[PDB]
Amino acid sequence: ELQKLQWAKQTTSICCYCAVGCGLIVHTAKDGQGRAVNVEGDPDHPINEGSLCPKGASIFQLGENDQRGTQPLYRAPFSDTWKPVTWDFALTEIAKRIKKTRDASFTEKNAAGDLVNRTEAIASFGSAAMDNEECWAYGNILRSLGLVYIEHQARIXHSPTVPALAESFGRGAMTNHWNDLANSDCILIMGSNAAENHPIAFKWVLRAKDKGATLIHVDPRFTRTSARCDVYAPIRSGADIPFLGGLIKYILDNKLYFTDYVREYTNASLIVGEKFSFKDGLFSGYDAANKKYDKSMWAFELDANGVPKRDPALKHPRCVINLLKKHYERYNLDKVAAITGTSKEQLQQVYKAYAATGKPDKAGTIMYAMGWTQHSVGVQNIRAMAMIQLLLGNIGVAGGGVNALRGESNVQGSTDQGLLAHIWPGYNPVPNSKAATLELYNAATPQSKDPMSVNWWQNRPKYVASYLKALYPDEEPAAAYDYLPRIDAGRKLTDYFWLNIFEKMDKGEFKGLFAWGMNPACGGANANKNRKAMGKLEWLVNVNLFENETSSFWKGPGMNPAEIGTEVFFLPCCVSIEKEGSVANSGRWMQWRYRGPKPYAETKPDGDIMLDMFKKVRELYAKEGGAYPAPIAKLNIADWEEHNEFSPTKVAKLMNGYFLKDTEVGGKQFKKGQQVPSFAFLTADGSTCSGNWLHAGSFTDAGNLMARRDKTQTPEQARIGLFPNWSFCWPVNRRILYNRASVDKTGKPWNPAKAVIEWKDGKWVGDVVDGGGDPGTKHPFIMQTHGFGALYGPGREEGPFPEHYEPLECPVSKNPFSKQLHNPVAKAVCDPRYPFIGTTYRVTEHWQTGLMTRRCAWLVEAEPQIFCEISKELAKLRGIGNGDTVKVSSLRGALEAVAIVTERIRPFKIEGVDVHMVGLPWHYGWMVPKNGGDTANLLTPSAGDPNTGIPETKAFMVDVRKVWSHP
Amino acid sequence: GKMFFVDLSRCTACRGCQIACKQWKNLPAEETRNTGSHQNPPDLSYVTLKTVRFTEKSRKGPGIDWLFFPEQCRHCVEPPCKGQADVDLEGAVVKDETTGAVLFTELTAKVDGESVRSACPYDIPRIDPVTKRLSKCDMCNDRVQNGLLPACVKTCPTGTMNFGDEQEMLALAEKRLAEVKKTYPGAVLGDPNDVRVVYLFTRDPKDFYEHAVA
């Protein structure tokens, strides 16, 4: 017997850090009644098989940590000290702050006199770190309170590129999953440092290489990933579109595209209208005065039924694929090599290796995470990857996909639950002012006349109805619809997002901010400006594990508590291993985890905090009345609780959904109270509730499918690692999205050795088929209006084909592909005192702003201080030695760091000038540890991308100078 | 006996192994500074039995040869640390005859610590200044005898860390050396007949660390 574990209860959990979703085993003393005594990997988990990176591996030290919050703290206006206070006080005083601000700022109708039923004087940030049930509850609390300014993590790294995947494939999600990487024949890692940022991914990447795969890293820097790839190709910052356009030209010129796949399953055959043209860097329909396109100029030619016309022969000159060939002929190897700084020889090596996966018996995957995609053409960068994958037949297949790697453990879930301004849960849009009835709301959903187009979003009215019946089960949906707030139809959508929230705060336009599981004082670009702006709040509720740069901005560097009127409530929540719930990983695996030890001290699960905070607002409205009470008073919170506590199990069953009465649906009888077995059996007429249509199937009458720990696989499942009985993935346990594209029109796999699905004996065998229907009777992209993988994507603001427009403003003057230098539908100062391209990135050992990992002594041990990575060339130029202290400055601020001089950074050759990149981690903050240094976001601009509404954290101009020592 | 096969051609320097060793033994963190390197702690100590060493070598063409060395006691088949300590006191250094683990006891406080380190061809032994006890990797011998992999082996995502019976692990090391030489022609095993921690180096072991091999 091991003494350490002898009398400890073993429970399972899921890592609280990155979206790999590694399994943990937790040992809790006194058979569960004590503290954690051990946390390590779960040997039985199919993704990590017991392995953990230093973050997962140090969760014992995060949990059992004497620096954690113990109870609510209170900071009174102008006060220079915290005041320890009760939960009853804190949640009573906050309930009063909410109601006061709401009553004082509720608008029942906008200037145009349209029903909006909203507050604009409260914002909320967070959080991808919360459980799926807590995310869903939290959003519904904020909306019942009438908030519209509801944002989180996803906006920063994911929202800028998600449209690329929705336009191309019909969904925004990672197409495949982590185990599936082992089936790839060629892995292109581009805008990802996965060995550092998704480390257990490399179990599966290196297993692909074991079976013959070529691993390719395309990155401005040589990283821990690069060290373990066959091919490291340097690219200068922002040259990705040229790189990918060259590969498109290469695939097309050499006929390396998979014709039968392209002809049947992409929109290659669709006839684009005569009004479509491209000249001089501009598509047709350009309004030069307003810098925006009339996208109707890009419309397909339609047949008598309104269905886009097709030439299956692919000969018609206005076939998408012939227009694609014409568009990419400019992207020759010499121009691409010159602008990327990649050698022509290395371009041909990579192009040849990757385009070889066009053959049906080979699969290629692209892995990207954030990289540099936050800028206005990031979405076109990902569009190009999606197009390359559709040409090579790599969508829907094992070892294929666009593996858009999620960041936070539950950023997939937190997006799924609608913690962004523009979406309800299930990706049903937040209504605008003109959507004055539920009928009008539902009319906006596009229809198809093509009988082979599943066009599944036509089912939306069932999901909206069932979601209203989950919040308000005694109300008719049409009445419930009026309870939820609306954004102004007239207003630019990005006015409701992350960056405008900061801009408004700094104009004094918010009374209240929830900083719920986020560290905006460190995570937001231009920290000096945001730390000042937080002063202009009246009150701030910060819910986190530790005291931090956000909770305590008022006593941060250069601050004077006396002068700062913001009332701060710090509410300590419990770590992942101290609560029950689910997190949805990057592959959409919704994974149930259990409490090990009880919450530390008086800490609480987010669920209890938010439910108690709301219950107090409710009763405080029931006894004083005030602005529009109906939403608050009628919100169904009964279903969220058991034993006077937030119930993960009951919230998860509501999110799945149940029959509110006896219903016949899809030719089947269902009894009242029964769980909805699948979104296929939801109704629009009030027979069903469901908090989230994507969750219908996750928690059935068979039980909690998220909680399944079953490694049972058929030979064909096991061959590609589907693990269909291990937890559950939306939608309805389809592990590989778009898998109908993996078979021919008879239902036979293109690649039998790596079959995903196969038509045997009148059924689909393997994965769950992504769309019902006999072989050859449906288009394979069932969430697309038209049903095809879009090579030509006319919904995109910048055009239907990716085109190089220079993201790097300051050092670049020439676009070799057109006369259009910058994005024509999107001003940096480029002050010559700041000649260097600053960038920020992660290291394996730290998490996000470091709020969590700067409290972990083993992670501080490995990576104790902010550093500055620079080339030997920039070192030599600035007289900087390895280990020297340096000052990094921008127009926005300045900080000190330890110089790391390394050949892992080389100069970029731009128009015959060496341009120098400077690298910093954004993991450091003034609060901890001693001598750790401060946020790299002191240096970054807020300015923000006109399109994505996200500032620049990957290419911002700095200077670096040696800070002098005593001789 | 038991044996580690450590395939350094698979190592992503994630340092899961370095954290996992401290978590299992509840070892304290050192006070560390950044002095121009990701490496930290910079060395083995009484409270650090494993640290991942980082070395950068130039190569022609883009990138570098980045060399990662997760350093630990080699659990020598004929350990000289024992021979030296046995001069001053038997039972200070012992050998588990089941696993082959070389184990320091509390009686290391009663022998000449500096001599025991000097006798280590790999320069592994470390001395507590207060107690004068010696510490090092102990093979997680308690875990091993209770069916579990050592902490650093279980935690390792890449397949760098491998552990089992010496015959299986030597056969694995030989088979893997043949495959790894295809992409890394200078690949060698470290002292494979003398030690229970058998590293596969992608080039000259000394490039990884001065004491990589005896």
Ligand SMILES: Nc1nc2c(c(=O)[nH]1)N[C@H]1C(S)=C(S)[C@@H](COP(=O)(O)OP(=O)(O)OC[C@H]3O[C@@H](n4cnc5c(=O)[nH]c(N)nc54)[C@H](O)[C@@H]3O)O[C@H]1N2
């Ligand atoms: N260890 C660890 N892992 C994490 C996190 C963490 O803090 N620490 N955070 C998580 C979160 S929330 C997210 S969203 C993800 C982000 O994951 P990643 O996107 O992998 O994160 P970064 O290291 O910021 O950037 C990835 C790489 O992009 C490269 N890059 C920079 N500019 C360009 C460019 O123009 N082109 C190309 N092709 N590459 C470029 C950088 O050199 C870097 O190596 O990581 C997640 N995982």
Ligand SMILES: Nc1nc2c(c(=O)[nH]1)N[C@H]1C(S)=C(S)[C@@H](COP(=O)(O)OP(=O)(O)OC[C@H]3O[C@@H](n4cnc5c(=O)[nH]c(N)nc54)[C@H](O)[C@@H]3O)O[C@H]1N2
């Ligand atoms: N310069 C620069 N800035 C960046 C980035 C970059 O690459 N460079 N990355 C951007 C990206 S991709 C992202 S996602 C953001 C992240 O920015 P933030 O979300 O502000 O980062 P953190 O707060 O450090 O990490 C998430 C938080 O979750 C908290 N948490 C953990 N468990 C729980 C729990 O159970 N409940 C609650 N309520 N909280 C919990 C942690 O303590 C931590 O504070 O930063 C962005 N900012």
Ligand code: SF4
């Ligand atoms: S941080 Fe990511 S890779 Fe590391 S243990 Fe956690 S989930 Fe796994």
Ligand code: SF4
């Ligand atoms: S855990 Fe494995 S991959 Fe990570 S540093 Fe240690 S040996 Fe290398």
Ligand code: SF4
């Ligand atoms: S075998 Fe055990 S004691 Fe030795 S380095 Fe690994 S974790 Fe540490």
Ligand code: SF4
């Ligand atoms: S490596 Fe050194 S300390 Fe470890 S057994 Fe060999 S001689 Fe003893």
Ligand SMILES: [S]
């Ligand atoms: S994220």
Ligand SMILES: [W+6]
């Ligand atoms: W992120």
